[PDB]
Ligand binder design. Structure first.
Ligand SMILES: Nc1ncnc2c1ncn2[C@@H]1O[C@H](COP(=O)(O)OP(=O)(O)OP(=O)(O)O)[C@@H](O)[C@H]1O
Ligand SMILES: Nc1ncnc2c1ncn2[C@@H]1O[C@H](COP(=O)(O)OP(=O)(O)O)[C@@H](O)[C@H]1O
Ligand SMILES: Nc1ncnc2c1ncn2[C@@H]1O[C@H](COP(=O)(O)OP(=O)(O)O)[C@@H](O)[C@H]1O
Lengths: 69, 341, 343, 361, 70
């Protein structure tokens, strides 16, 4: 047989039922970088269909930089 | 006969590929294979035990790390950078005007090897190589010389600073492999050209340093100097700029021979244009005079390049024969090209 | 069927103590033995194998390694180039001549340089003329200098290679050396072949000190490569392509004393180029025809080629957030504003 | 094939000898000796074992860090094995065979006399100094213009009588991945202390002895730790070394190894460089070659070419027969080749070379 | 060179990051304190296509951060 799957090995997934810390209402600075995070994260997460409809392919690759702060 | 059906069983069927670490006079040789496996193997078979030497491939029979024989296997990248071949089509007769320039170095490469009688009977023997140089961007113009030397004997070309200071050295050890492998294939010739080791500035990747490039050039000298290698491997050196080259090179070698590359004269320029246009069909109105007079200090591949673009636009008109008008405007692309840059 | 369940028992017994290995032949030997290198283990050398033949076994091949005699059970497919064309396959798409526009003059002027030595070359000597060693592309980025490379090599079918390449092409190819002779060994294995210079065109790298030698040893890479091609080796069709802007146009042509290269310009974007290539990028997104492409391309003075991509895609963004399945002109103009904000 | 026939026919006795002592895998150094019988041992297998030895070995033959043979199953010490070294680099430096004997010297006498009696006389006749002792100096130094460096070394190779000596080039010390050349120089000193009165020579020391430092970041730090480490090996009281040393370079700088030498080392001698009549001796040893027309006057030629060392005038005696071959003449008159002489020293002195004083001055 | 095998692992999971396509699914987000030494194969188009740069806080971000922390 093989892994069920997926029974690992390591990591693991979750730890996010005891987390996260506080909501996004904390920081109010960005409002733009958070909108690129918005459209690049949870707009594709809710809709895989509207992209194929409009005919633009959403990437999964996300890279952040600029620290500090 | 029976020995072939005997030793195979002992060494058969599987056997590990081992590496000889060092030799003990017992006939037991300390060996090494992945990983950290030392041992004593006394065998009298297939050996050749003298010529093995440490750092070489010895067979290892699984019972137990026994050596039934040795296999020398290369390959190696540097053996691949030597040939092949070209046995190039370009004779020194395909270039002109340097007959006096060449005739000496032509001797010094063919004075030994081919036609040794005068050379060996004379008891003189200067087979230390040569040195070349010439402006402004020639030197492969002197690979039109060495391209005739590529038509005889044995040869390897290693040129450019890039192959020296590339990554963190290890200094000359690439130059060491070159020298020793060209000694293994001796007789041979090693052609160096455009030594920018001091002329280049930036260290490739993360590397240092200027003095370690100077000390790897230094060991290039000592390995060429040298203590103590009579092997030949003759050395031909060339460059654009003789200024940055240090005199530490010249007294060991090449002390006797170095040539200067002049720029061509009227009859040499005309000669070269005739050489390149020998193949190409040209229109009846093509004239070389206005060409060699209008141009200033052009070598072979310059006017050869104007032949190349003349045939390029001749193919834009799909004519097998180049017209002098399209030769003067197509020329004007290189004329303006050197006037634009 | 009753015999197969018994077969699994006996077969289990032969694979139980040692199963069977997976070998890799580094070289074959004259005594019918074959030098085999296992990944976790050291190198071996092992013999016939009456079912296997020596002429069927060439060095650098994955071979099922028998466990008992340590011999080869099967021949299996290996992968050599897929790291070459992998490192390159992530770099650049295929990009046929339908993906490019405005370069018709320049693809027409490169088609002789690349397409002559591939199909015609006997007419080189019919004209008596030498073969082009390479080509360069100089122009403000801009895009298309990279697309045209794998466009010409895509329609020529000759294998496409971009130069270093990091980091890991020094891994797969060779060990340590000048290394352009080992890359040139791959280019000899697969011929005809295209070598592109990727990319080292930068303002980074505009200091004329670090980029001087740091690039000038890729310029020296192609240089001594041109010593290889020009002076010796064999035969043709292995060619080099440049992508630069300025400086090292003057420093390379300072190292190219009229010799040797084919000069081909790379243009800045034009308004009609923005028209038709703007339609080329706009064909892939559900949209409305109400857009005027004249004024929406004239809204982009200067800019670049990938500017068209950012305009069309980043317009599609307001279309997807707007919930419209098809877009409108006003949105493509909003994306014109977006890409002109950084200007 | 006959030698390989008898070569392969000894495997029948070899396989009987193959059963015993084969277990010698692997070589292993001990760490401590727990008690009289028991020794704790580390092997490059990376497992570590406390065990006795094969009783044919005397238990008093073992020292700490001693590579010793093993019977792998019992792990007992099989046989003590002397060598713990060496990577192929040092044996690559280990030198053999002579060449270029004494008379090949170009007339330098005081130099060759001092650098001769400093090595031969203590090594040839050791009892002499032990009688008059006192002591002969540790080491020497050579330098100057290239002509002639490193060639008198070849003479030391020729006149070398019995115990071999190890040549060491300058660049093989410096390597990347720092700490390699240190192990190198140390282990070659241990070798020379095994080789009983064997000698060492160093060329291109000016590459590895660059002194002293820069601001930062270094820079000399690897160079420093290697050279200062060399002097560190030189400053331990033992022996040191009964192995002499030899130092030949271009430029006398740098000062740190040059201020570390005069304490241990001595006998710094400088070239010299052609004498007026000294050049006629190179013309004599090099006159044995080819053929000399009996009219040829050497001193004229020698006084006409100052600052030529022996190499430039060796290329003079060379271009003699060269233009003699180009003229097909079997012998070359002094007036025949002197055109190629003023041509080689004039034309070849025009562009470059001979600022070697200036290199070290 | 074991870590050269883990950047070969970066290329492995890179090929797998081409394997998530098409559609369902993953979101690969990433950040770094210095992005200079990042080898471009990742960032180069086709795999990681989104370059986000945190700006230094400005007058808007100043007042908003003052209000939210206070
Ligand atoms: N005084 C001399 N006597 C004999 N031969 C000489 C003399 N001067 C020069 N030569 C010859 O000239 C050649 C070149 O000298 P050599 O290369 O040995 O010096 P070098 O090695 O360049 O010195 P360095 O090691 O400082 O660079 C030698 O082969 C030698 O035979
Ligand atoms: N005077 C000439 N006669 C014939 N051929 C020439 C001449 N000058 C140059 N060539 C050809 O052009 C090339 C010149 O090489 P070049 O680029 O000038 O030197 P480098 O590449 O060393 O800077 C040579 O390969 C040679 O075949
Ligand atoms: N002439 C052009 N007009 C508009 N867009 C272009 C043009 N050429 C290329 N592009 C776009 O640019 C992208 C990549 O361009 P590339 O050739 O990599 O440019 P660069 O070499 O500057 O990176 C392609 O996906 C293509 O859609």
């Amino acid at each position: 047989d093989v892994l069920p799957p997926e029974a690992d090995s390591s990591i693991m997934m979750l730890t996010s039922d005891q987390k996260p810390d506080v909501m996004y209402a904390d920081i109010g600075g960005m409002d733009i970088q958070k909108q690129e995070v918005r459209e690049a994260v949870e707009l594709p997460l809710t809709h895989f269909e509207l992209y194929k409809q409009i005919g633009i392919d959403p990437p999964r690759g996300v890279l952040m930089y600029g620290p500090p702060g | 006969e029976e020995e072939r059906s005997k030793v195979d069983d002992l060494r058969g069927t599987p056997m590990s590929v081992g590496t000889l670490e060092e030799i003990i006079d017992d006939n037991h040789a300390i060996v090494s294979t992945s990983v950290g496996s030392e041992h004593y193997v006394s065998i009298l078979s297939f050996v050749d035990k003298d010529l093995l030497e440490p750092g070489c491939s010895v067979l290892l029979n699984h019972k137990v790390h026994a050596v039934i024989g040795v296999l020398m296997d290369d390959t190696d990248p540097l053996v691949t950078v030597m040939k092949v071949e070209k046995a190039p089509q370009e004779t020194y007769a395909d270039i002109g005007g340097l007959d006096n320039q060449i005739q000496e170095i032509k001797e010094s490469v063919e004075l030994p090897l081919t036609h040794p009688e005068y050379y060996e009977e004379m008891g003189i023997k200067p087979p230390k190589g040569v040195i070349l140089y010439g402006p402004p961007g020639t030197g492969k113009t002197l690979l039109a010389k060495a391209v005739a030397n590529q038509t005889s004997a044995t040869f390897l070309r290693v040129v450019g600073s890039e192959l020296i200071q590339k990554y963190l050295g290890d200094g000359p050890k690439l130059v060491r492999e070159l020298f020793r492998v060209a000694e293994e294939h001796a007789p041979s010739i090693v052609f160096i050209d455009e030594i920018d080791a001091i002329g280049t500035k930036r260290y490739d990747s993360n590397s240092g340093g200027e003095r370690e490039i100077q000390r790897t050039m230094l060991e290039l000298l000592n390995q060429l100097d040298g203590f103590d290698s009579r092997g030949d491997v003759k050395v031909i050196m060339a460059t654009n700029r003789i200024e940055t080259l240090d005199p530490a090179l010249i007294r060991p070698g090449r002390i006797d021979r170095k040539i200067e590359f002049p720029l061509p004269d009227e009859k040499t320029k005309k000669r070269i244009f005739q050489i390149h246009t020998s193949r190409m069909t040209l229109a009846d109105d093509v004239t070389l005079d206005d060409l060699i007079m209008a141009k200033d200090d052009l070598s072979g591949a310059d006017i050869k390049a104007i032949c190349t673009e003349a045939g390029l636009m001749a193919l834009r008109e799909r004519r097998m024969k180049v017209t002098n008008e399209d030769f003067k405007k197509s020329k004007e692309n290189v004329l303006y090209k050197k006037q634009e840059g | 069927l009753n015999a197969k369940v018994r077969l699994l028992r006996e077969e289990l017994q032969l694979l139980q103590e040692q199963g069977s290995y997976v070998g890799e032949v580094v070289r074959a030997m004259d005594k019918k033995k074959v030098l085999v290198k296992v990944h976790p283990e050291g190198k071996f050398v092992v013999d016939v194998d009456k079912n296997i033949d020596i002429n069927d076994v060439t060095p650098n091949c994955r071979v099922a390694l028998r466990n008992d005699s340590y011999t080869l059970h099967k021949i299996l497919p290996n992968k050599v180039d897929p790291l070459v064309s992998l490192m390159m396959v992530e770099k650049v798409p295929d990009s046929t001549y339908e993906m490019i526009g405005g370069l018709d003059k320049q693809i027409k002027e490169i088609k002789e340089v690349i397409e002559l030595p591939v199909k015609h070359p006997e007419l080189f000597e019919a004209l008596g003329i030498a073969q082009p060693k390479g080509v360069l592309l100089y122009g403000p980025p801009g895009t298309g200098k990279t697309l045209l490379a794998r466009a010409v090599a895509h329609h020529t079918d000759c294998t496409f290679i971009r130069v270093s390449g990091s980091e890991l092409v020094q891994k797969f190819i060779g060990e340590g050396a000048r290394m352009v002779r080992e890359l040139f060994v791959m280019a000899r294995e697969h011929a005809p072949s295209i070598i592109f210079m990727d990319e080292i065109d930068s303002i980074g790298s505009s200091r004329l000190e670090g980029g001087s030698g740091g690039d000038s040893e890729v310029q020296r890479t192609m240089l001594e490569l041109l010593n290889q091609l020009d002076g010796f080796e064999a035969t043709k069709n292995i060619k080099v392509i440049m992508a630069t802007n300025r400086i090292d146009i003057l420093d390379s042509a300072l190292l190219r004393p009229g010799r040797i290269d084919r000069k081909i310009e790379f243009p800045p974007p034009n308004e009609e180029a923005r028209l038709d290539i703007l339609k080329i990028h706009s064909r892939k997104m559900n949209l409305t025809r109400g857009i005027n492409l004249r004024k929406i391309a004239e809204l982009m003075p200067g800019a670049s080629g990938a500017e068209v991509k950012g305009v069309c895609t980043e317009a599609g963004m307001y279309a997807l957030r707007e919930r419209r399945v098809h877009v409108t002109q006003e949105d493509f103009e909003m994306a014109v504003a977006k890409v002109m904000q950084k200007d | 094939a006959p030698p390989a026939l008898w070569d392969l026919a000894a495997d029948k006795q070899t396989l009987q000898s193959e059963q015993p002592l084969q277990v010698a895998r692997c070589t292993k150094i001990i760490n401590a000796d727990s008690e009289d019988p028991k020794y704790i041992i580390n092997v490059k297998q990376f497992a570590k074992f406390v065990v006795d030895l094969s009783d044919q070995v005397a238990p008093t033959d073992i020292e700490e860090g001693m590579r010793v043979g093993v019977d792998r199953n019992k792990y007992q010490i099989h046989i003590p094995l002397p060598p713990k070294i060496d990577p192929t680099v040092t044996m690559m430096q280990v030198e053999e065979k002579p060449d270029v004997t004494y008379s090949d010297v170009g007339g330098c006498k005081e130099q060759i006399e001092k650098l001769r009696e400093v090595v031969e006389t203590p090594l040839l006749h050791p009892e002499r100094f032990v009688n008059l002792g006192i002591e002969p100096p540790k080491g020497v130094l050579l330098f100057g213009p290239p002509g002639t460096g490193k060639t008198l070394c070849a003479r030391a190779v020729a006149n070398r009588t019995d115990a071999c000596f190890i040549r060491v080039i300058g660049s093989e010390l410096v390597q990347k991945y720092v700490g390699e050349g240190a192990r190198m120089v140390r282990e070659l000193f241990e070798m020379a202390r095994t080789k009983k009165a064997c000698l060492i020579f160093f060329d291109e020391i000016d590459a590895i002895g660059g002194a002293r430092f820069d601001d930062g970041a270094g820079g000399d730090n690897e160079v420093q730790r290697t050279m200062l480490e060399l002097i560190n090996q030189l400053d331990g009281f033992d022996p040191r070394g009964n192995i002499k040393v030899l130092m030949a370079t271009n430029r006398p700088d740098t000062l740190d190894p040059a201020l570390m030498r005069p304490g241990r080392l001595d006998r710094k001698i400088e070239f010299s460089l052609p004498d007026l009549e000294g050049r006629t001796h190179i013309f004599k040893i090099h006159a044995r070659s080819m053929s000399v027309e009996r009219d040829i006057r050497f001193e004229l030629l020698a006084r006409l070419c100052p600052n030529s060392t022996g190499a430039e005038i060796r290329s003079v005696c060379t271009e003699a027969g060269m233009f003699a071959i180009r003229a097909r003449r079997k012998i070359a008159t002094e007036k025949d080749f002197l055109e190629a002489v003023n041509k080689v020293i004039k034309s070849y002195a025009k562009f470059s070379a001979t600022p070697r004083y200036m290199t070290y001055n | 060179g074991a870590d050269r095998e883990v950047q070969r692992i970066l290329l492995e999971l890179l090929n797998q990051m081409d394997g998530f396509d098409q559609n369902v699914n993953v979101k690969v987000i990433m950040a770094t304190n210095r992005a200079d030494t990042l080898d471009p194969a990742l960032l180069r188009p086709g795999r990681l296509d989104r370059k986000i740069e945190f700006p230094l806080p400005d007058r808007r971000q100043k007042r908003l951060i003052f209000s939210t922390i206070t």
